[PDB]
Amino acid sequence: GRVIRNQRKGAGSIFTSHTRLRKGAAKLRTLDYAERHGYIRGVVKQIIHDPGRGAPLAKVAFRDPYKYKLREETFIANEGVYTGQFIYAGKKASLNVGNILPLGACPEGTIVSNVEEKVGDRGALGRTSGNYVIIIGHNPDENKTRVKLPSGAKKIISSDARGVIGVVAGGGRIDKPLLKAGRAFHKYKVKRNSWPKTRGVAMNPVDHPHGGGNHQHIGKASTISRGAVSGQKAGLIAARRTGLLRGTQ
Amino acid sequence: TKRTKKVGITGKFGVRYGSSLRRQTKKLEVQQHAKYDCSFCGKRTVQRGATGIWNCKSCKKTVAGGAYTVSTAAAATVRSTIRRLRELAEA
RNA sequence: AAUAGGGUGAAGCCAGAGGAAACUCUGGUGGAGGCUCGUAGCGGUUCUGACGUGCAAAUCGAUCGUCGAAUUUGGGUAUAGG
RNA sequence: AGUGGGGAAAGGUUCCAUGUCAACAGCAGUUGGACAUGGGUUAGUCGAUCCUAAGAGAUGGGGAAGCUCCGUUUCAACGUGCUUGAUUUUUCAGGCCAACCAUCGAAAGGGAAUCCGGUUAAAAUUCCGGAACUUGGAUAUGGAUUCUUCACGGCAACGUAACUGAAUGUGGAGACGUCGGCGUGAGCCCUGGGAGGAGUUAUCUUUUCUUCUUAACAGCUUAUCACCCUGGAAUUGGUUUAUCCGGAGAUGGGGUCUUAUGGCUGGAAGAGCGCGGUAAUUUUGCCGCGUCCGGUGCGCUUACGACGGUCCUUGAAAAUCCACAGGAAGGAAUAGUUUUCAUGCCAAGUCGUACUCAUAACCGCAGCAGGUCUCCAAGGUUAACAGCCUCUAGUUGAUAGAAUAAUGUAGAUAAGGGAAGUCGGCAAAAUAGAUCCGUAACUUCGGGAUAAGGAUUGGCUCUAAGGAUCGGAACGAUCAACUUAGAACUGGUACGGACAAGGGGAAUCUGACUGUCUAAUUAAAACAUAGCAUUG
RNA sequence: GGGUAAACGGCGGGAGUAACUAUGACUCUCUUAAGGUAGCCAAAUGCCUCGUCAUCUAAUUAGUGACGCGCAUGAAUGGAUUAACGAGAUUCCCACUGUCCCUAUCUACUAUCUAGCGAAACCACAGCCAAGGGAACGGGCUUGGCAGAAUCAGCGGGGAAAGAAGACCCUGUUGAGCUUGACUCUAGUUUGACAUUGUGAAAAGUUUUUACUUAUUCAAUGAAGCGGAGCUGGAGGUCAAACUCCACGUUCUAGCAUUAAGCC
RNA sequence: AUAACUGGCUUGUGGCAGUCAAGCGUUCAUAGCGACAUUGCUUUUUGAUUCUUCGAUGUCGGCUCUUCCUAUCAUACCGAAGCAGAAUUCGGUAAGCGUUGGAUUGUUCACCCACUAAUAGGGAACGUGAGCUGGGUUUAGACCGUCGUGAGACAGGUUAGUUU
RNA sequence: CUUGGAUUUACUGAAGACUAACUACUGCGAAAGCAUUUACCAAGGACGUUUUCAUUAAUCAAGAACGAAAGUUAGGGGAUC
Ligand SMILES: CC[C@H]1CN2CCc3cc(OC)c(OC)cc3[C@@H]2C[C@@H]1C[C@H]1NCCc2cc(O)c(OC)cc21
Ligand SMILES: [Mg+2]
Ligand SMILES: [Mg+2]
Ligand SMILES: [Mg+2]
Ligand SMILES: [Mg+2]
Ligand SMILES: [Mg+2]
Ligand SMILES: [Mg+2]
Ligand SMILES: [Mg+2]
Ligand SMILES: [Mg+2]
Ligand SMILES: [Mg+2]
């Protein structure tokens, strides 16, 4: 047969992300002395649309502690953040929406966003519109914090890891139907080349494992082993169960 | 006169896409095209730019909000939760 | 970079009429839409027309689809034979 | 929306003149994009050149037997650094910085600066004449400024001929989608008077056609928006075609700004244009007169403006230029400073530039009915940039002559019947514009719908309605656009008179829809799609 | 061993009956599970088949509506509907007509004839029939009919006319595309051991756990503030003497912070 | 060297025709029929075979047009009857002359409606595609049902498919 | 379901519900209904009044608000039944 569309994506020729119009990488500040020991104050200059992103971004200006200079940061805007708002980041920062605090400095039940998986990676968790991380609890003896991720998973992170207080702005986006192929066209026109999708069952056996037949049908179980190889993993990979989800999980 | 009985702003879609999808669109699109009261200057001059961006024509304040409303219920709940935990922490 | 001229007439807005209220009716205004008739354009339905040692190794004629967007297109650039 | 006038790609001398006909131009040939000989492309201002885009790709490194692969600042000791006071001691003294930063990548993106008239056989935003401009350099004079050292005025928005400002920093310009109506301008279209020229003239026609123009650049002036001062608003007012604004200060009164755009003047009438009278084998002319003053708009095209709509879509970068913050350093009195004020001096290299851009200069073996990106765009009819006729411009090219059998190809018509033809109404016919009337089932309430189904439409002569600017007025004066409605008359009952231009209805199967593919036998019920669900 | 069908898929054979006739509402047993539910249908899916009934017509293997033990319908291998849309397939009606009865006439361009110009396909030799025999359908052979130069416009009976070493079929120890529980392997991946690989403790009988950091691995930064201690306060109730803990310059505001003042 | 047309041999089968005469026919074998048997013809059926053609003879049907056969449906003239007439049936010479318009189906075949003197049957490479048409079949697209783990199969249905 | 340690036992935690006992011929509300604490928000009946207005009222076709449980649509939760 032929190399399938799953496998053609890794080469990344026509499958790279369309990034001309993007407004920069959304990151927290580099963890420095001011954030480790006290707090630093910045001012929100802009709240802008980032193409390919549902969440707006905030452009926040900070002073450089060591040279006469201004540092502009690209944060993910939490909902309620406004232009001209003062943002405080550090260990001694107060519990206000938009402030960047270590996870250990936030009491249980604190809603936080753009949370660091590891100390100083500048944000990994809860970055999409309407999403957040709930702080479940602390283990001060081991310097660890238990959090709940948007997927429902519980994670243990260093208490020195940082997050931004509040919920990511732009939520409820999925509530509206797209209603049109053109709307999805414009949605992925500034994301990447993954739309539209031809069904593999509608191809020929060269093109896909589902192709061929005198009727369109998969023919074998569409649940595929985790240990299958590239060119085989088309369908439901390592599926623990299938069918309509009935009852609680 | 009243021009449409029920489609309203969704009368631009004609007969396409299904009635359930069109009334579901109508609910959120009246909200995304409405004018909201500015919490800064007090005028009802706040309109959406892109999703999550709500600008006031008068005082030129931009606030991060929801996709189709200035404030979501989840954000209001988080605002009160944070206010409460701040009060307890600072006594 | 390109896309005559019409039709329909969505929100919003103004006025009048009715109602106890919750609210309703009428006339304008407005100018929405992967809306519509229809040029350029893009396409290529039918005649199973012409031609079929052709004007042409795919064209010609009428008829036809679509025609403001998932539109059409120049140039630059990327992807290379299991 | 050209058979007109230019260009991009591509060609490469096909351009122009002279000669010329063996071959080629599927007839001919005295002609030619053919053949032969010569000639021809002039730039500081137009491009390239420079910037960065998607991307391409060295270096340090790391792979790989290796050809080479990765990577683009990456685990790198990465400046052929600058700025000054100099020194003439051709030595120096230092002061700052070195996040990023090899390089290539656009004749449609970004970007310093030129126009008019004339001139050739063939070149011209390139030559000639005149008139400007930019950048770089040099540099003096005038002005400006200083004894209160680095200017004044205005309440203010801010103004000006100038009117210190290092390191470093902050900003702005470069720099940005699309659509809708409105407004303004320009060019074009239309039109009145006058001064010329041509045409018609049996008759009519103060007539029909035509000339009456003004570049870049300089000065003054000119604007929506925005802003400032005054003032303090419900009896809420102002206000757009479009309902937005005002105690976060409206209406009213007075101002400030951008100069987009127009006006006046200089450029500039000396040019060009239109006439009349003359010179001459004659290179080329010489003389005189005129070239003036208006009006109009749902007009067309285009530019700009203030607005409004739209997106789970929010619509490049960099070179480069400026301003501001900061306060280093240096500055006067018998004199000091500055080339962001005026004037003056010098220079601007390299390569491209002819011509075609297509029913004969390109690609399809060719002078091939195919293909190949884009700019400008007159009158009439009309909704119309459609169709039809015409002006400017350009062509009149395509082997021809004589006849007019059959069978064709393209096109017409047909008594009575009206799908009996045929697999099948295939093909053709019928309908068709506009105004008014009337419009069913079903429906996701949006539609269906131009459903279905009817009436009218010419020409002429009238009538009515619909506005602007002035004057202190429910009125007068002047001026003005085509829309709509009604009536009479009229004719071989014709009249969307050519052109242009839906046939309709009742149902079943199927795909929801718009969209997409088998270039060159299949456009579909196939693919996609929104929606739904599952998996990691 | 368990779970999972909006995973691939599957959803059947058997055994009796109502005061005319007809029908059968009326129970268990097997296949590796369940045994086709709601719906829909001679449907683009029904063999029999032009199914049967009704309607449409003068007449209908067509159409529509019904029926349903359905060869072999059926639920995201989606079922049933469905307004709108469709150069999709189909039936009927009105209008319309040369589609037809059944043809006729007209126009231009051909064809035609001339001057000039001037190919190609094809060609064993060639070119009148009838019968015979024959590789079983002759232009030629045999036997007959016959048979007279040179030709023009048409034409499509024949030349088993031309175009192509049949594309169907079979054979070949000839392939190729595709597939799978074929034969034989394989990139990848997973699992163990050895090496990289060192320093301790404890416990199990060599194995398990956790301590160290320098090997190795991951990440960031223009390698900016690390580790320990000490200055200053706030505290514990101080029972010797100040030990332990905490902090140690920035939070109404869209301003500013750069090239050290000061002291010795 | 070998199948899927035509053609050739064969004629089981299909079709058509005789001979005998048990019975039928009020009686009566033979007007008209005719069992049990038996002899043939035909090549308008389908088989059997594999001779020709696989360096290709264009494979359904219809439309169009000509011709031929006769085993005569009609028309001419006649013989026979269980022929009174009328109608009908059996038969002879006879192919001179005609043998239709439509609904459904791609159909050949079929089946109805209707007219008619009658609506006979066949052949000509199952006449006839450089005559047409292209509805069917039988390339490649697509759908369904059953079958297959699958790629795929179906001589099942369905829709679209260059005729030099 | 269980020698793979079930059931049981102590400690700890997480989820959703629900508010026992007190709880009654007791309370509140137009009805449906309402039961852990506290705060906030706006209501309400009765009572008291030598306050105020003076017929403003009663019941009501039309027309409205609320309306147990179950059920429907879409998110979230899904302990127990
Ligand atoms: C002289 C020109 C006429 C002469 N006449 C005579 C009468 C007649 C009658 C017809 O039917 C009554 C007819 O049927 C069509 C054609 C004619 C011819 C047609 C021809 C022009 C026509 N030639 C062929 C195609 C064509 C294409 C064009 O672009 C085009 O534009 C100029 C024109 C054409
Ligand atoms: Mg999808
Ligand atoms: Mg898909
Ligand atoms: Mg396919
Ligand atoms: Mg495969
Ligand atoms: Mg598989
Ligand atoms: Mg398959
Ligand atoms: Mg298929
Ligand atoms: Mg399918
Ligand atoms: Mg299967």
Ligand SMILES: [Mg+2]
């Ligand atoms: Mg449950």
Ligand SMILES: [Mg+2]
């Ligand atoms: Mg459209």
Ligand SMILES: [Mg+2]
């Ligand atoms: Mg359309």
Ligand SMILES: [Mg+2]
């Ligand atoms: Mg065509």
Ligand SMILES: [Mg+2]
């Ligand atoms: Mg054809």
Ligand SMILES: [Mg+2]
């Ligand atoms: Mg021909």
Ligand SMILES: [Mg+2]
């Ligand atoms: Mg392109």
Ligand SMILES: [Mg+2]
């Ligand atoms: Mg035109």
Ligand SMILES: [Mg+2]
């Ligand atoms: Mg041109």
Ligand SMILES: [Mg+2]
């Ligand atoms: Mg020439």
Ligand SMILES: [Mg+2]
């Ligand atoms: Mg010639």
Ligand SMILES: [Mg+2]
């Ligand atoms: Mg010659």
Ligand SMILES: [Mg+2]
């Ligand atoms: Mg030459």
Ligand SMILES: [Mg+2]
């Ligand atoms: Mg230039």
Ligand SMILES: [Mg+2]
């Ligand atoms: Mg790049």
Ligand SMILES: [Mg+2]
């Ligand atoms: Mg490289």
